[PDB]
Structure formats: structure tokens, C-alpha cells
Amino acid sequence: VVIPSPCCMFFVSKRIPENRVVSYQLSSRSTCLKAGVIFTTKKGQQSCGDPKQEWVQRYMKNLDAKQKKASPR
């Protein structure tokens, strides 16, 4: 899937447990006041994650090898 360019209202109080998160949704827009990523839990939740944190980049790092099916090589 691919998120369009939505936004958020607040930043997660902290990171998330990889055992609960499933995938994020980057939302870089100018009409908004700030820019961050949106993560979601496997239970059906959705929290906005900040890129300044390493759990967004970390998840986003492993998520890139899954979603973006580059190649088997």
C-alpha cells in the first residue's frame, strides 16, 4: 500500500514495540505545520511517529526491504 499525504495532530509520546507495529505511512506535506511518519499497530491502531526517532527509521529501514520489493539478488 502507499499513503497519499495526510497529516497528524500530535507526536507519539515515544516509540513503539516492533512486535505491535506493522507498517508506517510517510506524510510529507507543506500545508501542515510539521512533518512526521504515521505508524500503525497490528491490532488496528494508528500512531504518528517522528523521523527524528530511530524506531521510525528502524521500522522504515526493515519495511523498505519488504514493501519495496527491489529484487531477490
Look-up of cell digits 529484487: 71
For the chain, which domains are there?
A: 1-73 (2.40.50.40)
Query: In terms of residues, how long is the chain?
Result: 73
CB-based contacts of 47, cutoff 8 Å, min separation 6 = 12, 16, 38, 39, 40, 41
Amino acid at 3: I
For every residue of 12-71, which 3-state class applies, written as one string? CCCCCCCCCEEEEEECCCCCCCCCCEEEEECCCCCEEECCCCHHHHHHHHHHHHHCCCCC
The answer to whether 53 and 33 have CB atoms below 8 angstroms apart is no
